[PDB]
Amino acid sequence: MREIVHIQAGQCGNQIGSKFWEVISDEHGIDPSGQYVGDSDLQLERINVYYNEAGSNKYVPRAVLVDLEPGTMDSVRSGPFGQLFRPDNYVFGQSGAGNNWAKGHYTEGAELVDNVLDVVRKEAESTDCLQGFQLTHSLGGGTGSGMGTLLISKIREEYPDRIMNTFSVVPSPKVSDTVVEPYNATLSVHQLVENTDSTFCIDNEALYDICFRTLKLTTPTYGDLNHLVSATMSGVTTCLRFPGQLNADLRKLAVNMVPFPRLHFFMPGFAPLTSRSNQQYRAITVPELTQQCFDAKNMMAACDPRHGRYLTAAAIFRGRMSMKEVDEQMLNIQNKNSSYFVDWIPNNVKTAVCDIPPRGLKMSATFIGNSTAIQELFKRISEQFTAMFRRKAFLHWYTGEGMDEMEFTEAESNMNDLVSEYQQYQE
Amino acid sequence: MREIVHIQAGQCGNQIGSKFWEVISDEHGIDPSGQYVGDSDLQLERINVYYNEAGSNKYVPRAVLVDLEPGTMDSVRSGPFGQLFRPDNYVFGQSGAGNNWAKGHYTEGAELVDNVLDVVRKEAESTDCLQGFQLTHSLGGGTGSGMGTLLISKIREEYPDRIMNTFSVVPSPKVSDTVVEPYNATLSVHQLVENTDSTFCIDNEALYDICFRTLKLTTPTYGDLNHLVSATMSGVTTCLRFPGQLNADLRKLAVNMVPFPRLHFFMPGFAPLTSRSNQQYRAITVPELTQQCFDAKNMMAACDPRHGRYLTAAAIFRGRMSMKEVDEQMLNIQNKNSSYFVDWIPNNVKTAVCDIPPRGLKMSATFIGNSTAIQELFKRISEQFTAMFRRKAFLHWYTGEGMDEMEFTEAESNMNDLVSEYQQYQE
Amino acid sequence: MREVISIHIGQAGVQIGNACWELYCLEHGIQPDGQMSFSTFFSETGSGRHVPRAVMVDLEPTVIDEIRTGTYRSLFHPEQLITGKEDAANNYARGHYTIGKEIIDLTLDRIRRLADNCTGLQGFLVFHSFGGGTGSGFTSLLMERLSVDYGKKAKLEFSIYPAPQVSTAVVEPYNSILTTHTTLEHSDCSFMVDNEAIYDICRRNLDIERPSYTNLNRLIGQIVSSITASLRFDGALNVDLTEFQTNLVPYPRIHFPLATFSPVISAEKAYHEQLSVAEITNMCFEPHNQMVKCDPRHGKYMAVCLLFRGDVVPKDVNAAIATIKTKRSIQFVDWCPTGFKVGINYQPPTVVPGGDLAKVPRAVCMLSNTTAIAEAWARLDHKFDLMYAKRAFVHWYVGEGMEEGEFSEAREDLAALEKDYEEVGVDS
Amino acid sequence: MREVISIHIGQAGVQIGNACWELYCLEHGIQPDGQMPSDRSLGGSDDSFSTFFSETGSGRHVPRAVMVDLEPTVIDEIRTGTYRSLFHPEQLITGKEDAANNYARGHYTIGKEIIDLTLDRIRRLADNCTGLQGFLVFHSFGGGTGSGFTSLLMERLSVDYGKKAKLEFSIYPAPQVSTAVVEPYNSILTTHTTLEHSDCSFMVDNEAIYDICRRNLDIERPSYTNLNRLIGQIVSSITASLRFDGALNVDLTEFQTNLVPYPRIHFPLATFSPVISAEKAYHEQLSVAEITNMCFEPHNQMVKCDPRHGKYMAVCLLFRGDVVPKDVNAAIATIKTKRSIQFVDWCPTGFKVGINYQPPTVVPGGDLAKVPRAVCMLSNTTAIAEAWARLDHKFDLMYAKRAFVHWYVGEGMEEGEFSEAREDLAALEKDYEEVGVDS
Amino acid sequence: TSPIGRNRPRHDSVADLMRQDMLAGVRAEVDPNSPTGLKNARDFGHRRIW
Amino acid sequence: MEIAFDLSTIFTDNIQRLTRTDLLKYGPKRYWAVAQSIDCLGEMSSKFHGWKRVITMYDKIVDHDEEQTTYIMWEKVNGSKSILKGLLRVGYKTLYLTDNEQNQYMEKAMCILDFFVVPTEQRSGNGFKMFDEMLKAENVTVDQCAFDKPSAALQQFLEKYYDRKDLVWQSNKYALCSNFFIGRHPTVP
């Protein structure tokens, strides 16, 4: 009834999407071959939101796989859940864009986007009522950022009314691995601001810090980070798939978060993250869940939440729990930390409860916060971009594809505009 | 409602505390894995006194396990009941104190006491009504004697009203195992006098004597000594955890046992101590239990009670029995040994009866004695300290660590003043 | 899927290719006679024979005849072993103008035939030496023709550069200067290596008292395998050739990075070493561990690429990068705050039987674009100016078809390149 | 995690290091090539072997030891012997030529040539360390290489680290068994440096172990290997507390605090009470009482000095094996009963007990019989002053004639240093005499 | 031979960690002859006497 | 515990022999099921042993210097989902042995690196089939194999089957039977 189109662009996007589909299949009790092996009838009540019926009790994800490097596609297909998808949905090119935004946006991206849009439209026309689009990508890379910008622009042109949310991985200096990644981030934030209803910023540095401190992982891998992102994404859309005391789907959340159309960058979080030893000795309670949701460390943005003020914050809970127990906790949070919430909004907090927890978990809470603290990431990106653009660090590679230098100057100004308006309400 | 917080310091204190929680879990019907396996709801009706609940029928002790050397920490963790404890309560430094009071009381204890106070306060604020703290440590060592006293002073600063119990082990020359222990003992006696509400001196020589003759153990080790100490542990506090005709908490015991604030050094005992082969050789009833509570060779302290009259005595019985029989036995004991009690006190002994006996015993009695004979151990320690300080046998270590001769002289003067105060009532 | 063509010119290039193809056969399990992921370097025939995508050309057939009679005679398809009648006699003019045209047509036709065989041509690999006559004139002609024909296709090369002291030919500076003009003109990225630095590495780290050309070629082949592994082996943070060029080429002319393989240590010592990621990353930046005879501390690092292999965890890489950045001794340009290009591959390196390398569990190859490399250009320019002030050996070159003014044009081009290196390194 | 660093200097130090490291490898189940075949034990008692052996990335174990000598032959034996692959090659520091039994050569001329390399290797080893507990030094007083290099290196280690403990087990010269004609000079010279820059020095007398092996072990003509094995047993028994769990543990800090009443009184004795041949030990139970009695027997002392002529100030008993505190208390009471063992009046409780459940380990074909329990007595006594008095007498007799002054002064030595060391040792003897008199 | 593919980078350890259900709660008994077992049985342990 | 793959399509029988060569032929590029199964079995083993590290994973087995073999038993449950039941490892290693009376020895012996079975399948005669299949596979007897620090259940099993009790301990943490037919002692006891 409210199905969602899922697209994965770039290596990081494909890996995150594969982990997310694995997590969803675990939640829905779906065999990797696509067959249903769940033990509850409630799972199949709203399985159509993410999967398409294959008739013989088989279900396939409504996912579109696109990547310019066939190696990632081959790895995903050979992965644990490769056979879950259908071979028709796979889209790939010949060679990667080479971390070049212009290469992946003007020539190679322009050549592939025809097939990408064709398969996306074919998937979209098969739905009952398309709730919206979700896309997984990384701003640091070239292929992912360019293809994501081009595809989101095309979908906004083709779907002027549907919700578009992107789960982007925002690069940070501490775990930086690409020399030219600030250029890609600067070129992508422009289109993200222009044509995205909500963009969830993810920092690898923050994920590593959480895994090291709270999780106490001996040696975190990309699988663990992808699992964390997948759990958060599943928690976000739990209202569409399962019943609850207070339903909060994508549209209601989008209305309740953004004060203004272009301030649509959220910072997520997840509650029940607990170390191995503390799992058996921690009394998981709604106060504990909300305390760790509002904890600075648990937050997946490297920017400190205290270095700013929360405009709007939403916490989505899963499992059976009394409404009053959640409302009192929200009031306590808003009273104790009143300095961290903006006064001009009468009720800064949004709540949501779902009756069905994640599989194997008693109850979970998913937190998303639209705070002005996100401006620190954009400030760092703008500083790096200006430092590189002052001496024309790598502009010849991008101009070789025909992209004009004037585009860089305009994007930097729009970068300033996004920071300025965030700073406009920052006090 | 009346919660209690436990602190364990030094290897000796940690061992005694581990035995304490083992015995308490046996009485409260808690499996070593942390799950409730009790049968009678009375074991669970007031389990909050010692164990915090995790919600899922799982309880964790309200204990603060701490020691300078992590070796004791992982030794406890590897123990049969080590899993039960909360990992966040395990606090440790780098290495052991080296039997040095200054190391554990002025530098290393100085760093560690901040974290110790943090965890203790956090754990205490989780209780509805914390009655007080009871602690186990060893005088002869450095870690205990220094850092436990520092923590006691800090807690007294942070909690001037809550009761404090220091179930501590004092050194004796007969079973002396450390050359430098008298220095630690004399440095800790003043702190215990000035920052403790109730002190229960324990000596290993008395424990070995009891095991050799009273209980006839062939080759007892530290385990059996700690088991006897833990039996006394449970006996002194059995009232708070079970119903009884004469309900007396630690506050009532302190009021009855402390004629004057500086006379709060006690001397415990256990009544049903009898050998395995003599279990059928003797039938257990109130008369001989009361007699054994005052027997010299059944007393937990090395000093002979005969040489010093009791000031006040406390007999805490458990199990079903007749109140009038207990009163008759106590009055007969008081009358038959009037020369062993102070005349100016109209009634030295105050009793208390519980309705639940320890498992494996029909009924048990725990003796507490504020006898003036305690001054003998203090006299021995003081004369040893004077002999050692006449030539400054090991003063150089402490002086290098920051100690001064003035502190040693002050501690010796205070301890001699305590001995003189006991002698004042010794008539 | 993604193929790359290797072309060998000159004795140095031919021997380096011999070593690297031996290493590739060891890595992929291909038998030395061609019997038996590998599509990047080999073409699988229907009959099961595996043919390397390599071209063997040399004006003197002796070095090629060595392979034709050696272990790998059946490895290479016969037409790939192009030979001339007589070498260039260490003369750039002889190598290019008078002679090289005789076989340049056949060589380029063979290159075109091999290219049309594959579809995913990522780029080209050229092995040669500046000092030699063939490996400089023929290399110049072939690579300029290749760049004219293809253009946007990647063009990588590994060139041996004359040592400050170890010079086996008197006319090395002349040919090196002549080639430096065109290697700046067509090559997308040139990997310059000096023999003396490899000798020092073998003497110090490997503790070998008597090194040889075999060890040098083995190390070069190991570095080429490390750079090309990302195209044929799985691993997080894959680094393609295009990604590599985008990362380490900030300016169209500044495309001459260094190269080094860090975990080079004796076998009897390797067993007693932790070889942690942080330790190997730290010792990557050792001034004496760079195979170009120039101190990195003299210059400033501008763009650095790391290609970790084997048991590597990204968090350890991040910690190593942070520690390196905290080290102020390793200076960086102020306008490139994030010049580190991290690459990880799950395939551990292999050890050549009889080779000096030990079986380390993890390895990393560090390729940095630094201004310290200008010392080699300074030395070469000084040598060329001293040798050309009196026109020592100009008569051979002018008699072999080239004009006198070409030497002056090459010298002024070298001066311009050195000026660009000096200017790019200034603060903003 | 806790770890210690062992340093061996001179031929004696190197051989003692070889023996003790063999004993450690046997105790922790480590192959002579550095392999640990016990894969399951790698995940269990990790701290045990990690105390002495560092962990490599290949699963091998590298001892935290430094093999340093001014000449290579004694180290060439290791590089050619069974344990060639056990030790890390860089820690096998070898000079060009020996010191020729001259302290000046090993302190001024030849020592400085490799002292920098030795300090660099020690720094590299310590950087990998995290919970460093102290240093173990092995050298001979009477030799030249040992006495010189130890003197040069101890001050550098002290200035580098300071508060870190520095423990040395050294072979004190015999009263009658003389090996070098000029050993008293080196002994007197190194007495000054070992007093200032140490925490506790353990005396060892070759003739003492000779007679002990003659009597208890029944072997008439022992070699240096037996002495090395016994000293390795001593050091392993001392260090068993750090790397194993036990009741009433005594670590380095506890040992130093108990056995060092004053900064200049850090020269305790050492003895391993249950020394007995395999055939003899079968006829005795070797319970705690009898081994404790043997602890204080003068014939069981590993230093040729008469305890009855002096007094015991502080005594440490690091029991290992099946021991319960009741036996220790009974044994200590029985020891205190007799008046032959006289203690200082100002230290009534000068006993420091330490118990470990790790049984003593006997090497294959070893002289020591397998025994369930063992005790390693460490005592600070004034009876050691007699050996120092004899050594000072010999030094004065030799220096009166200026017999070998030229050899020393030809290598950057000043004649006044001999007088300074002599007066330092005389003052130290006077300090023992002063502390030994009762109040 | 063949290239060696490592599953450790592909391993997902937080999957158990995020799942509140734990297969833990059981411990392996220490060997009595081992020093840890000796300590646990004697110094920690106590033979019933009442 | 549970694996989401049909192990019958890759494994010939219930219990399979997995030499390093077999692990190479069963690489995790497209056969992730077996690598995940062996890793989960090793993780369960370490968790039961309560260790700070795991000793049984695909990477160290394939990277191990000496050749090793692995034995896994499972059970078919669903069409594309099975269950993990047990594990078994052994290999060639060289040891220095010492029997009673301190007699030195040296030989190549079957050193069993690990035993573990899933706790939900504890008891009920599990693993004796693994014992028999191994000793039939490499045709060695119990007396010819070395045991690496057995836990009490292990020598309990050795006295239950083959009646090999009174295991002799070794300085290298290994244990073997009192019967040493190898002889050829380098050193006279």
Ligand SMILES: Nc1nc2c(ncn2[C@@H]2O[C@H](COP(=O)(O)CP(=O)(O)OP(=O)(O)O)[C@@H](O)[C@H]2O)c(=O)[nH]1
């Ligand atoms: N009744 C018991 N007394 C013990 C036990 N363990 C030690 N002790 C006594 O402890 C006394 C010395 O104190 P400690 O052992 O705690 C030494 P310290 O406080 O410095 O702690 P650490 O530095 O952690 O060793 C000494 O008189 C021993 O007889 C035990 O298990 N039971």
Ligand SMILES: Nc1nc2c(ncn2[C@@H]2O[C@H](COP(=O)(O)OP(=O)(O)OP(=O)(O)O)[C@@H](O)[C@H]2O)c(=O)[nH]1
């Ligand atoms: N690293 C390395 N350098 C080599 C090797 N063989 C030759 N060289 C170098 O190559 C140069 C010699 O000139 P060449 O390039 O062989 O000569 P050419 O005229 O180009 O070709 P030929 O006449 O066929 O040798 C010198 O710099 C040598 O040090 C080798 O195996 N390894």
